[PDB]
Paper text:
The second enzyme (E2) is a unique dihydro­lipo­amide succinyltransferase. To form an active complex, multiple copies of the E1 and E3 subunits attach to a core complex made of only E2 sub­units. One arrangement is made of 24 E2 subunits with an octahedral symmetry and the other is made of 60 E2 subunits with an icosahedral symmetry; both arrangements utilize trimers as building blocks. The E2 subunit contains three domains.
In our attempts to crystallize amidase (EC 3.5.1.4) from Arabidopsis thaliana, we serendipitously crystallized the catalytic domain of E. coli dihydrolipoamide succinyltransferase (EC 2.3.1.61), which belongs to the family of α-keto acid dehydrogenase complexes, in a novel crystal form and without an expression tag. The structure lacks any observable electron density for the E3-binding domain, N-terminal lipoyl-binding domain or the associated linkers. It is likely that these domains are removed by endogenous proteases prior to or during the crystallization process. We have crystallized this enzyme in a new condition and in a new crystal form. The new crystallization precipitant contained only NaCl, which differs from the previously reported crystallization conditions as shown in Table 5. Even though EcDSCD is a well known highly crystallizable contaminant, its structure had never been reported in an I4 crystal form and SIMBAD did not find a hit when only searching the PDB unit-cell parameter database. Even in the I4 crystal form, the two trimers of the asymmetric unit adopt slightly different conformations, in which one trimer rotationally expands away around the threefold NCS axis of the trimer in comparison to the other trimer. Consequently, reconstruction of the 24-mer biological assembly using the asymmetric unit trimers and the fourfold crystallographic symmetry leads to a 24-mer that is slightly stretched outwards (skewed) compared with the 24-mer in the F432 form. Because of this conformational change, data in the I4 crystal form could not be processed in I422 and the packing is different from the previously reported F432 crystal form. Crystal-packing analysis shows an arrangement of a physiologically relevant 24-mer core complex in this structure, which provides additional insights into the organization of the E2 subunit of the E. coli KGDC.
Author numbering:
A (entry chain C), B (entry chain A), C (entry chain B): 172 to 404
D (entry chain D): 347 to 404
Write the structure that this text describes.
């Protein structure tokens, strides 16, 4: 023991903290995990990265693949793309995806609207536009309100695996993690692959085991072979 | 935005959702993990599978090994085979084990009664009889009521690892997962084994760290060498 | 089913159970994971173990390394070394570290005071002195009250990974686990190392993703090369 | 302290090259005897060959 410096909570971190609590206490939040081999997507960026930027005037990142994979998973599992509004269950026939962006002063989740209708290049541009506004802090309340599902990337900080927190009134959240070289079994041979752990936190009131697991398996399948988005399999 | 189809929840899904919430909020649910090498059990099924079905008229699955291992663990750790009834702690001197079966309409959990008194062949017969009733939907209220402990298998859906949800008034739940070929250290050499992650979610009000961890270690020990059930070690 | 043996809870375990609930329901508890190579620390114990005990009259364990690493991480991330008092955030300018000790009568968490001021030998002596008092049950109310952060070691019981529970009014808890030989990627070659999973459960009201992840990465960095504690890098 | 020079050294019965420096301690033999002077300089050698010994204090 020694001394104590009390610092009061600002209007924001007071209501952010009240809302994370009311989220945790109002939902039956559970987390299902999976792993994904990133070499396929890393190879696409290594091969077509130059040609992609020349054609579209924006660099090909990972986030466009994650969004494209989440939208297809939201189509196959419409129970995950829903809210609970008191006594009603609201199924959304559109794909608005909340996406956590870093600002030095707090962390915000702006919304990408009608992502089902955007190309890979268009997605990466809308993320840069929202990410510039976040870093500068010029983000509208139009930009922050709504969203059916959140993607968070704690991998920028080197986290192996974690339990992400649901952003109500949303039902689920997908947590991206660090890409780490790990020995894997490949056709009965021990081969090193760049592996990432995926976490899906989901509300067990609305989403049962089969849907939560199957949703996250869908995302794993479409990240390990982006070509499956075209075939739809 | 586009359109949304809201459909109100009946007395059922309204109060099932309120009861999953009051369960989650009224217990101190935590999850401890472990891994198990399935090659020993996979080898027993490959070797004695034909001879077992001929003799008993029922196929040798994994679930008989899991039940046999859970019952022995419930005997060694009686704190896990208990409920909390308000101000009382109810220790059960019998082994009724809830067991999740896959049904087209969600997932249902019939109860196996006095499993301590059943042979491997008897267990596999009672599970097939309850699994047929689940798939057909001919499951009695006698069949669903009660149970001291739940075994859930999200591995049927290809989940790597997850936090299963306790089914009150029960204290704990064991989550089985996908069996995945993974490189393992065996006598200082890298050998590929079929590995499964085990998850035990437990009520920290009744079950402390030592009991929860030790219970799940017991199940790992008895699945990696089923011959330990006979020796009792 | 057969019979059931009902045992009442005294105010003993009645108010512990009520307080685990008010802890869980008053905090937004999340858990971030990481892994650490213990070979460096295991090699130091194998090399200097004899010479250390001769010089200080106390055996060199792992817990001195974990405490030394936690204190340095608490300095780099002061938001983790804090409590929430209603509308205030209380920053502590001292390092009192709660440390879970296993006793036949439940589990107790005595406090190590001003650990920032203790050498490796002093730490190991204070842990043995508090561990003897726990096993004997001669532990003071001075010894149990307070603490800014908890370290728990469920690895003594062979747990692979788990979600530790926050010890209010503290913000976070670090969970140590079993050391298991696992194949690891080292300069693109598969080498077997003695690996342990780390779990940090944290209150998301006060601790955001960047701090929680970065705190646990700091502990991993200082356990994989204890010589970084001296250099402070 | 002196120059660091690559020199062949005996290491677990194998000749391996290490970057070696000679240490000199000049001491007043009125106040410091052989055992203390030698033991002082051995301590410095031990703590420079493994700086992690400063943390453990061994
Ligand atoms: Na794979
Ligand atoms: Na194993
Ligand atoms: Na490592």
């Amino acid at each position: 023991a020694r001394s104590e410096k009390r610092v009061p909570m600002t209007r924001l971190r007071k209501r952010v903290a009240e809302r994370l609590l009311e989220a945790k206490n109002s939902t039956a939040m559970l987390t299902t995990f999976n792993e994904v081999n990133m070499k396929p997507i890393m190879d696409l960026r290594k091969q077509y990265g130059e040609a992609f930027e020349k054609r579209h005037g924006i660099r090909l990142g990972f986030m466009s693949f994650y969004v494209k994979a989440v939208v297809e998973a939201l189509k196959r599992y419409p129970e995950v793309n829903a809210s609970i509004d008191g006594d009603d269950v609201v199924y959304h026939n559109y794909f608005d995806v909340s996406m956590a962006v870093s600002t030095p002063r707090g962390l915000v989740t702006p919304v990408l609207r009608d992502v089902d209708t955007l190309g890979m290049a268009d997605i990466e541009k809308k993320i840069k536009e929202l990410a510039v506004k976040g870093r500068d802090g010029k983000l509208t309340v139009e930009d922050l309100t709504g969203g059916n599902f959140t993607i968070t990337n704690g991998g920028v900080f080197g986290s192996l695996m974690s339990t992400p927190i649901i952003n109500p009134p949303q039902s689920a959240i997908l947590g991206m993690h660090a890409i780490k070289d790990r020995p894997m079994a490949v056709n009965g041979q021990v081969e090193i692959l760049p592996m990432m752990y995926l976490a899906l936190s989901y509300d067990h009131r609305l989403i049962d085991g089969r849907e939560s697991v199957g949703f996250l398996v869908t995302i794993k399948e479409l990240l390990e072979d982006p070509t499956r988005l075209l075939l739809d399999v």
